[PDB]
Amino acid sequence: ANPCCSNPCQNRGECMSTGFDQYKCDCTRTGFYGENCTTPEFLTRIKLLLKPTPNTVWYILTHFKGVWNIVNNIPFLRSLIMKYVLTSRSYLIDSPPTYNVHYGYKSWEAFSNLSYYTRALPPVADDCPTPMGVKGNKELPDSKEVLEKVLLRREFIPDPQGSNMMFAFFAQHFTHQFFKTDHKRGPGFTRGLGHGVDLNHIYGETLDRQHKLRLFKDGKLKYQVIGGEVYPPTVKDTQVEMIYPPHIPENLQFAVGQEVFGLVPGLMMYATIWLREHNRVCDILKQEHPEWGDEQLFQTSRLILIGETIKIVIEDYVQHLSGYHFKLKFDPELLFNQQFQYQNRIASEFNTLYHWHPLLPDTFNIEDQEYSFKQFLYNNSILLEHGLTQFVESFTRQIAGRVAGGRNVPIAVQAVAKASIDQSREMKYQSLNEYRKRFSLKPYTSFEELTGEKEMAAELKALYSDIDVMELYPALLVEKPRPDAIFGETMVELGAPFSLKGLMGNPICSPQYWKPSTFGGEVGFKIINTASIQSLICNNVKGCPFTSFNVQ
Amino acid sequence: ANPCCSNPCQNRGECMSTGFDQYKCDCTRTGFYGENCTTPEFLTRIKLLLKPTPNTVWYILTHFKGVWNIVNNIPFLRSLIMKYVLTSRSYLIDSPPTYNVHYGYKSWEAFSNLSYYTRALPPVADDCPTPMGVKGNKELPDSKEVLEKVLLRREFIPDPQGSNMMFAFFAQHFTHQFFKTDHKRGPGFTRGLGHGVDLNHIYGETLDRQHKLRLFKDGKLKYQVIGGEVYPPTVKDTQVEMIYPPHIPENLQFAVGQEVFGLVPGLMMYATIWLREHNRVCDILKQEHPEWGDEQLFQTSRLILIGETIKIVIEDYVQHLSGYHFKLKFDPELLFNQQFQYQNRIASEFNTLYHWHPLLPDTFNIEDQEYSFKQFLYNNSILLEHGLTQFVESFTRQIAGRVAGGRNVPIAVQAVAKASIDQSREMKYQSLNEYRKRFSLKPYTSFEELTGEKEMAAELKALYSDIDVMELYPALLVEKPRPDAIFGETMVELGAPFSLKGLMGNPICSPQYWKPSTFGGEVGFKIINTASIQSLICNNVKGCPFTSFNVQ
Ligand SMILES: *[C@@H]1O[C@H](CO)[C@@H](O[C@@H]2O[C@H](CO)[C@@H](O)[C@H](O)[C@H]2NC(C)=O)[C@H](O)[C@H]1NC(C)=O
Ligand SMILES: *[C@@H]1O[C@H](CO)[C@@H](O[C@@H]2O[C@H](CO)[C@@H](O)[C@H](O)[C@H]2NC(C)=O)[C@H](O)[C@H]1NC(C)=O
Ligand SMILES: CCCCCCCCO[C@@H]1O[C@H](CO)[C@@H](O)[C@H](O)[C@H]1O
Ligand SMILES: CCCCCCCCO[C@@H]1O[C@H](CO)[C@@H](O)[C@H](O)[C@H]1O
Ligand SMILES: CCCCCCCCO[C@@H]1O[C@H](CO)[C@@H](O)[C@H](O)[C@H]1O
Ligand SMILES: *[C@@H]1O[C@H](CO)[C@@H](O)[C@H](O)[C@H]1NC(C)=O
Ligand SMILES: *[C@@H]1O[C@H](CO)[C@@H](O)[C@H](O)[C@H]1NC(C)=O
Ligand SMILES: *[C@@H]1O[C@H](CO)[C@@H](O)[C@H](O)[C@H]1NC(C)=O
Ligand SMILES: *[C@@H]1O[C@H](CO)[C@@H](O)[C@H](O)[C@H]1NC(C)=O
């Protein structure tokens, strides 16, 4: 019934009903006008014929290694490039946020209520004839069918970019501070009221949880010593709630910021690393400031670790999966003369695209042993023995799965992968081609153009019938990968704007915060600005083992 | 004890202890360097010699009624001027926010915890030898003494700027939506988690309260008809929490968004007027959108009313107290090519300076009658007896009291005045001159320069002893007023930045929100862009009585 169900407004113009069967497009500040915001203005037609495709820009970024070697060694040139990639990725994101799962129009409820994941595209209205608006059948194809035919793993397909388990667990650990779905309320709801990098997965979301985790001495986090090694404290000791099956012994019920980090030893490994890092920074800050009390030591350390995180995420993590020869750089100052909002709201689609299930291996290989999922889940005794030591060394060695390309979702987590599809439909996501348009990408004209092959393309065409009906999440895992890349075009071009917004939108990146006294002076500032995944491990893991997000 | 107790860093530089008896100033981006950030750079002294005193600018704005008459009638010129007053006032505010009552250093707790008022200047550390840091005696002068000698009203001093009771009650009504002090936690905390103009004083702070105030038909708020007039619903009907003395009859316990608006008929006057305006906009939207449902009518009306409020506050309210001949303008588009953060955190000092108790008259004059405080408080039967039209007419006529100039706080609210002083101290406010320096004002060299006279100055000198120990709140009420103005220099130069940040920081002012379709189309958009306190009253008060913020 809703006349806006067909999504008739193009180029990010907004649709509004004006009658029971009539609509209007608001073309304000789109660069276009006309009934559907499709006829371009003069300056717009100039930009459109000058803006290179994302695949072209990707090509330039991933080739000419010698040229980028010169550029990377020229500070003013490097900063200039990093500035551009920052600003253009940012303008793609609505900030302050607009829609959520219950509001396909701007409202104060949608803006103010921090319990919602925001939304990059409004939901399809409930009174639309089809799930995607007006196209397709009354029901989307059977999600079991999609899952089994084009997503499930026959045999392991390794990432050609060489991502390892250090990367995969880092991705899970890091993003689980802002992907905290409130399952009581629904998939479109979050428990992460910070909506970004606040390290609540280390420090707890609430003050009460934080204080239970605190030592209240020298700014430090509580911990225990097992075999001369430092590990998180137990549930019995701190009384903080953790999720654990009942058969788990008390001495292994480790207590950390995120309640669910006890379920994967890979998570607990990073939880331990960061706990050691915080207490390390406390020691440094106490050395510099003997006059400081516990509270200032703790807070400043936390601000420093927030900095380290953002540093490591941009210059190691995002650097690795980008495949760029250009050396990405964390430098807040690059935005000081730019128009930029120091705020973020985490989008539901950013949650959805991050369901990187095919990253997981068939078995978790730690030195001699090869563990199954059942052996690996809720099992921290694995962590203890092999250690922080062998865990880093082993996870650095083991290859991870390719995400795009199709048919690489491990069978164990098929329930989780089906859930991703079903919840996307529950939240009334628009089609793949809609999101591609929302992010300045050309819509696919066939399933073959999407997959880059024929077998899976034919399978999808039988299921969905029309390419404009194809859903975002399955397309992300079945999309044609870039040449020897882990990802297709859609994943990168959606993920990068969301990610950099989250990273740079942090208050510590704002001019009033980005100065040495915020971090206890030059020494604390230095810890931020020289952070790396390697130094993170080196300072806190015994023996300083080598590490990387890629297989050696 | 603390080496930063004497506030050694000048020009917004940040002090940090580097030992038990050593400090360091972070002079980053201040334009100054050196130990205390006092020796300027080249561009600094240029600007310093080019930037005129606030009194110079105030003089130019409040003179040449004939020249401004031309400027105002030239759209591009007015826009250009308004842009300048907007950008410059805004840059004075820290955004994202920094300190609060418990944190004299940047911390994630201070940033993320919305229950705090923020603070333009950090508190004086608890271990400092004197209340203001280093200067003065161990004890501030007796607040009762300060109160009775330079604050209490002898005889009513009328505002020479002509502010009426429509102004005073609007000021109390409008600001109580973001000055919602949570006295259970302390004076440094707030219940207004939206930290701005969200109209929670009409719609309720929480969702369940909003729903109790809602009719769930045509987007409208619940109401009742008494005589033949529309009034807010009862507590009995809506079951919402209001604050009433136990002797107030059930048919007079009106239910509104703000729980305390039932205690002052002037507040209930505005609550009624805005309730009518919401339901009126619902009728307009429903006419334009017969296809819309209750929820979208409510949300869109709330967005429009948020717009009307900001429009009126800038072009009528702030316009009136500025005294400017230049016609201020509400136009979000002015900031679209400017660096500006669409966010805001209510500052404690903004709350403090906004306690304009001397605005209150000796009696409340409504047509025939003249009511004392005891008769006026809690007495909505007065509002029913006289009606909205008589209220508006009477309050438009009645002059309000002068705020600066000293000795004009009525004896009834002397308890409130003392709490202002007392709570500023509890919250460890820095001295008046520290706040003047914070806001680019020259520090007062003597009590005589502060007051502009001799008697009060002498009393103040015997009480505080040193001018650099003078407190902010009494200084504001005692400060020498501008010629025929309601305020002195400090009130205006502190108040304008906080105010315009709150007004323009609102998300509806952002380019993503500021378009017709946000407000249900061109018709809804016109309601915002043509709003005035006059039109508000004319549309919603029987007979369309004349109104203004100044005595006719
Ligand atoms: C944000 O919105 C959600 C969804 O409307 C609110 O959660 C509802 O709260 C009411 C209480 O008034 C309950 O009756 C509902 O069952 C809740 N629904 C869900 C899905 O949880 C939530 O209260 C809102 N948050 C704020 C701060 O207003
Ligand atoms: C914001 O800060 C206040 C002040 O610390 C927090 O309130 C305290 O909460 C603890 C429990 O965690 C109580 O024991 C204290 O009595 C509270 N103090 C006051 C003054 O209320 C509050 O929890 C914080 N809010 C959030 C959302 O973190
Ligand atoms: C040419 C090498 C430096 C260019 C760095 C560009 C970084 C990514 O830039 C992206 O390009 C996309 C395609 O044009 C656009 O869709 C995005 O808006 C933009 O963020
Ligand atoms: C000259 C008429 C146009 C100028 C309008 C300026 C409106 C108020 O301008 C203010 O002036 C103050 C005094 O310098 C400064 O402290 C503030 O930064 C600035 O906003
Ligand atoms: C109605 C006035 C009540 C408050 C005044 C009580 C405190 C007395 O205070 C005195 O008041 C004198 C008369 O104004 C002044 O001349 C003195 O400067 C002042 O100290
Ligand atoms: C606008 O879009 C609608 C739906 O996509 C279509 O029916 C209509 O013809 C379009 N109008 C123009 C002028 O392109
Ligand atoms: C947990 O790991 C240990 C190895 O340390 C293994 O022996 C044990 O069987 C595992 N637990 C489960 C339930 O599989
Ligand atoms: C810096 O400030 C402190 C305290 O205000 C003062 O004692 C000191 O002399 C100042 N030093 C300089 C170089 O101005
Ligand atoms: C309230 O005002 C009415 C006038 O309408 C008056 O009759 C009544 O006495 C007042 N009540 C109090 C408690 O002053």
mmCIF file of C-alpha atoms and ligand atoms in Angstrom, chain A residues 6-8 10 23 35-36 38, ligand 6:
data_model
loop_
_atom_site.group_PDB
_atom_site.id
_atom_site.type_symbol
_atom_site.label_atom_id
_atom_site.label_comp_id
_atom_site.label_asym_id
_atom_site.label_seq_id
_atom_site.Cartn_x
_atom_site.Cartn_y
_atom_site.Cartn_z
ATOM 1 C CA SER A 6 9.420 0.388 -4.636
ATOM 2 C CA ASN A 7 12.259 2.577 -3.323
ATOM 3 C CA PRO A 8 11.690 5.012 -6.209
ATOM 4 C CA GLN A 10 17.631 7.410 -6.269
ATOM 5 C CA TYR A 23 4.862 9.782 -3.168
ATOM 6 C CA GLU A 35 10.726 13.138 -9.688
ATOM 7 C CA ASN A 36 13.140 10.377 -8.686
ATOM 8 C CA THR A 38 17.810 10.966 -11.284
HETATM 9 C C1 LIG C 6 10.173 7.048 -10.783
HETATM 10 O O1 LIG C 6 10.250 5.733 -10.213
HETATM 11 C C2 LIG C 6 9.019 4.999 -10.258
HETATM 12 C C3 LIG C 6 9.257 3.703 -9.517
HETATM 13 O O2 LIG C 6 10.601 3.262 -9.660
HETATM 14 C C4 LIG C 6 8.608 4.792 -11.713
HETATM 15 O O3 LIG C 6 7.371 4.090 -11.784
HETATM 16 C C5 LIG C 6 8.482 6.142 -12.405
HETATM 17 O O4 LIG C 6 8.206 5.948 -13.788
HETATM 18 C C6 LIG C 6 9.773 6.944 -12.254
HETATM 19 N N1 LIG C 6 9.628 8.264 -12.854
HETATM 20 C C7 LIG C 6 10.582 8.835 -13.592
HETATM 21 C C8 LIG C 6 10.264 10.191 -14.141
HETATM 22 O O5 LIG C 6 11.658 8.284 -13.807
#
